[PDB]
Amino acid sequence: RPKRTKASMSEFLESEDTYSSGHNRLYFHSDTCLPLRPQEMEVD
Amino acid sequence: YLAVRECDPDLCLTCGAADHWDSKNVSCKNCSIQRGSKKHLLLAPSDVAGWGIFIKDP
Amino acid sequence: YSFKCVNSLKEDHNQPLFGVQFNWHSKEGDPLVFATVGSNRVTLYECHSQGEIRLLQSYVDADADENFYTCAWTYDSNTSHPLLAVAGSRGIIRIINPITMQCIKHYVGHGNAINELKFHPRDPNLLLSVSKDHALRLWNIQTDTLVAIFGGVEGHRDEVLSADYDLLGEKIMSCGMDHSLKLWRINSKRMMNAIKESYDYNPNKTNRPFISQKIHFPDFSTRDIHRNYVDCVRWLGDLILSKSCENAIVCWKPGKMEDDIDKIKPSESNVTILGRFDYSQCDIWYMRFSMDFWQKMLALGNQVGKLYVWDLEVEDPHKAKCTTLTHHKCGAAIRQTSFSRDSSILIAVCDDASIWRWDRLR
Amino acid sequence: KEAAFDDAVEERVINEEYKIWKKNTPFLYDLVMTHALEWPSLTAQWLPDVTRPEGKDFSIHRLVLGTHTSDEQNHLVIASVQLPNDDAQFGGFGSVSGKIEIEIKINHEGEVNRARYMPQNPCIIATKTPSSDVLVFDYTKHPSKPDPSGECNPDLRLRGHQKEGYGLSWNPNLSGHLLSASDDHTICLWDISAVPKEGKVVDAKTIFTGHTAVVEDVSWHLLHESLFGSVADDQKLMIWDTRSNNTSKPSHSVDAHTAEVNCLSFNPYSEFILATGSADKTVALWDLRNLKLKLHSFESHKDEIFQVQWSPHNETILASSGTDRRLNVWDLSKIGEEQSPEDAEDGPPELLFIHGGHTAKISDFSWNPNEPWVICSVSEDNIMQVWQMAENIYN
Numbered sequence: 133r134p135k136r137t138k139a140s141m142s143e144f145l146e147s148e149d150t151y152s153s154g155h156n157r158l159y160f161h162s163d164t165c166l167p168l169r170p171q172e173m174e175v176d
Numbered sequence: 177y178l179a180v181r182e183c184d185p186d187l188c189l190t191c192g193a194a195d196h197w198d199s200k201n202v203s204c205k206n207c208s209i210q211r212g213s214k215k216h217l218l219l220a221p222s223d224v225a226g227w228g229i230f231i232k233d234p
Numbered sequence: 235y236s237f238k239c240v241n242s243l244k245e246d247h248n249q250p251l252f253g254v255q256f257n258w259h260s261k262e263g264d265p266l267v268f269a270t271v272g273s274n275r276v277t278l279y280e281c282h283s284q285g286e287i288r289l290l291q292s293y294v295d296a297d298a299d300e301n302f303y304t305c306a307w308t309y310d311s312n313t314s315h316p317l318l319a320v321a322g323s324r325g326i327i328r329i330i331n332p333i334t335m336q337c338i339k340h341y342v343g344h345g346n347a348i349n350e351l352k353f354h355p356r357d358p359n360l361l362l363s364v365s366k367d368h369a370l371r372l373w374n375i376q377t378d379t380l381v382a383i384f385g386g387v388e389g390h391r392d393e394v395l396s397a398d399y400d401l402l403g404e405k406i407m408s409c410g411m412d413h414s415l416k417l418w419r420i421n422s423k424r425m426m427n428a429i430k431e432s433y434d435y436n437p438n439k440t441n442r443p444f445i446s447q448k449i450h451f452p453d454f455s456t457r458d459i460h461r462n463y464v465d466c467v468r469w470l471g472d473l474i475l476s477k478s479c480e481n482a483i484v485c486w487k488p489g490k491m492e493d494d495i496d497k498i499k500p501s502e503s504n505v506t507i508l509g510r511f512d513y514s515q516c517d518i519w520y521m522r523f524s525m526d527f528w529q530k531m532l533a534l535g536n537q538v539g540k541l542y543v544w545d546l547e548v549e550d551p552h553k554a555k556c557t558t559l560t561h562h563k564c565g566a567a568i569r570q571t572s573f574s575r576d577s578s579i580l581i582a583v584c585d586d587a588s589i590w591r592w593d594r595l596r
Numbered sequence: 597k598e599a600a601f602d603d604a605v606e607e608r609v610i611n612e613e614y615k616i617w618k619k620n621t622p623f624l625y626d627l628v629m630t631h632a633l634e635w636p637s638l639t640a641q642w643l644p645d646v647t648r649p650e651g652k653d654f655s656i657h658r659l660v661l662g663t664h665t666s667d668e669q670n671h672l673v674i675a676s677v678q679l680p681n682d683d684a685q686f687g688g689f690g691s692v693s694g695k696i697e698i699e700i701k702i703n704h705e706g707e708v709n710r711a712r713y714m715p716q717n718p719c720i721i722a723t724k725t726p727s728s729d730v731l732v733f734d735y736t737k738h739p740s741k742p743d744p745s746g747e748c749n750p751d752l753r754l755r756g757h758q759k760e761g762y763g764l765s766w767n768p769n770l771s772g773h774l775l776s777a778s779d780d781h782t783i784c785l786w787d788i789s790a791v792p793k794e795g796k797v798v799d800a801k802t803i804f805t806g807h808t809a810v811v812e813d814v815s816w817h818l819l820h821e822s823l824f825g826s827v828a829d830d831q832k833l834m835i836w837d838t839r840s841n842n843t844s845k846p847s848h849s850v851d852a853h854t855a856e857v858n859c860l861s862f863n864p865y866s867e868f869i870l871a872t873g874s875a876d877k878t879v880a881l882w883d884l885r886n887l888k889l890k891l892h893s894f895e896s897h898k899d900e901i902f903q904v905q906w907s908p909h910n911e912t913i914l915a916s917s918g919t920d921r922r923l924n925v926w927d928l929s930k931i932g933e934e935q936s937p938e939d940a941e942d943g944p945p946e947l948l949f950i951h952g953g954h955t956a957k958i959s960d961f962s963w964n965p966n967e968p969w970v971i972c973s974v975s976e977d978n979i980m981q982v983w984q985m986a987e988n989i990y991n
């Protein structure tokens with residue numbers, strides 16, 4: 133939900149003064165330090 | 177389990193430690209290391225420092 | 235012996251200089267092109283008469299802030315275009331085609347750094363990149379597929395930096411800071427199967443990636459040759475050269491003097507020492523010598539800037555009639571040397587971005 | 597070449613734009629969903645049926661898609677998704693378990709050129725395939741699990757087109773009546789309600805040969821079962837009526853634009869309004885009475901457009917997207933309305949909104965009933981995008 137807070141400089145200047153899911157990053161072949169492919173990502 | 181000893185296959189006959197040594201799934205949970213029911217892992221560059229380990233399954 | 239400095243050029247970057255390479259992969263009458271790797275710059279030149287040297291196309295690694303260490307001339311049979319692979323401290327291989335003016339083959343996977351580069355004498359598509367993590371990996375660049383890896387569980391427990399192919403490409407010597415002398419036989423029945431299969435691979439063929447192999451059992455090993463770091467070994471035919479920081483160069487053969495190199499079992503441990511072409515003023519490693527094309531003439535520089543020169547003829551370490559050529563202007567550190575595809579042109583490179591060409595006085 | 601070099605530079609650019617778009621996205625969008633699929637799907641559409649669980653903001657919605665792969669088996673897939681009906685519930689809004697998944701897989705042949713559910717029973721669907729026969733399926737009879745044997749059962753599939761093509765439209769009033777377009781320059785019709793146990797393949801009930809070029813779009817009037825029109829690459833569209841004697845002479849005809857046209861969309865509310873895009877960066881509309889005069893034209897898109905749709909619950913809203921990797925929203929009530937110079941420099945008053953949050957080109961975008969303020973969209977990068985605009989733009 134966007135917070136949609138109203139603009140206020142008295143608070144803004146004074147202050148100035150991620151729900152991911154799944155296998156995000158790429159994984160590598162442990163035996164040989166080589167990048168995996170999703171095709172063989174299961175039997176490995 | 178209170179002991180540091182894994183229930184020996186020849187002893188925890190009630191949890192099937194001896195039963196189906198060939199099979200992978202048993203009633204017991206403190207018999208795995210003997211059977212080596214390891215989980216599948218993934219190797220990736222860790223966010224913290226260099227290489228790291230990531231788990232494939234929940 | 236019949237040599238003198240006739241040319242000398244210095245790079246303006248003042249960075250330490252590294253491995254030199256002369257394009258012996260040429261044809262009769264081709265322009266005589268040689269290459270050299272600096273810190274991050276790569277430069278090529280062609281020797282010319284009268285002592286002139288014409289600077290050729292030169293590049294710089296303006297993206298990777300690393301010191302390049304090794305390079306090796308390359309050739310493509312398909313396009314008949316020569317190339318030259320490079321490597322450095324970041325352990326990444328780049329192969330630039332002068333015809334393409336660029337590198338389009340990217341190869342990574344080594345651990346820390348690369349300290350040796352050399353091609354197979356017969357197949358130009360096979361390369362050994364000795365690495366800092368004690369690893370010996372092989373690449374099939376033509377198929378871009380990896381080939382068997384050497385070292386592993388029973389490999390060198392220290393960083394290897396020096397290795398060599400034999401003349402026919404059948405056994406590969408390896409030596410590192412552990413002073414170990416491990417070699418592996420290419421002709422091993424298993425490998426060429428993989429090498430053949432290395433040339434037979436399609437990424438779209440199946441989900442299963444190519445299976446490069448692993449080796450841990452050299453056909454021989456030892457450490458008695460040197461009590462200090464070894465950084466220069468070469469295949470003198472069936473004989474093995476070896477140089478350390480201890481200001482000596484020694485040639486030796488496995489087992490007894492009558493023992494066949496190819497008959498030696500891995501369990502063997504005996505040594506036959508027949509080399510005493512010793513030197514001095516070069517008590518530090520990371521110096522590499524040069525060889526003539528025909529394996530008849532040895533020239534080694536010096537840290538104090540002199541030359542140590544011997545022939546590969548019947549002249550033997552029984553007396554070791556040295557030829558200590560020297561140019562007064564070069565005394566800082568002779569990092570490497572490089573012969574042409576003949577014995578007429580010698581290019582000596584100093585560390586301080588300066589090179590010193592010596593032409594044969596015949 | 598420089599073009600290869602510039603494209604490589606362009607690869608950096610699109611990554612930058614997505615990063616920049618992501619940075620500004622939360623303050624301009626009220627919902628941000630993203631999901632990547634194993635194999636790209638050409639088209640997607642919402643199931644009309646919907647259910648909202650009690651005491652749970654996330655609403656149960658179902659989506660149907662196809663499969664496009666390099667060399668593997670393709671499947672017909674139906675996937676479910678949960679979206680917060682209440683945004684007051686702050687595992688950002690719901691549980692950490694995830695709110696999207698796939699439930700149905702059936703072996704598919706080639707790639708889904710076009711597929712839709714027939715309105716009177718969404719369970720039965722027809723799918724345009726690279727093969728000449730138009731395949732027909734109902735997920736109720738077929739198993740949800742994929743069949744690894746590779747066999748497919750296109751029961752009650754449709755014959756009549758010589759080759760594949762694009763363009764599918766069920767009759768909104770007549771059950772089992774659908775118009776399909778093909779590269780055969782012909783429009784074929786079927787009557788599923790009248791289909792017997794003839795062998796699960798149905799020949800074209802009626803074949804039309806009006807357009808000279810490859811007919812690529814054909815649709816029934818959203819209110820009239822008799823009225824329908826077709827759109828082809830001939831840059832000329834023609835209006836048709838059922839039972840009108842010869843099938844090659846249209847009731848009406850007009851050239852939509854100066855380039856190929858492959859997108860047609862009638863207004864569900866206004867009978868007369870019929871929106872027509874074009875490949876010449878131009879989208880327009882026509883009147884059932886006034887065929888000779890174009891009502892208005894829209895040309896904000898920077899590339900070809902071939903997907904157009906009218907917003908549900910919103911007669912004044914029309915959207916279109918294409919190869920420019922941009923989606924343009926337009927306000928009909930704001931056509932020619934005076935605006936501040938800070939607005940004209942931004943866009944025309946009729947231009948409602950512009951969305952560009954996708955690295956890859958989007959081939960399909962689809963809203964759903966009960967949720968007029970969200971749009972699903974399928975890009976080439978297997979990315980499923982669902983997003984809600986701020987209410988502030990429409991007050």
Ligand SMILES: Nc1ncnc2c1ncn2[C@@H]1O[C@H](CSCC[C@H](N)C(=O)O)[C@@H](O)[C@H]1O
Pocket residue numbers: 222224225226227228
């Ligand atoms: N949280 C942490 N922060 C910094 N260094 C860490 C660390 N956890 C482990 N290390 C270092 O990592 C070494 C363990 S081996 C693991 C190395 C690390 N995961 C990498 O790939 O780079 C230890 O010697 C320790 O010094």
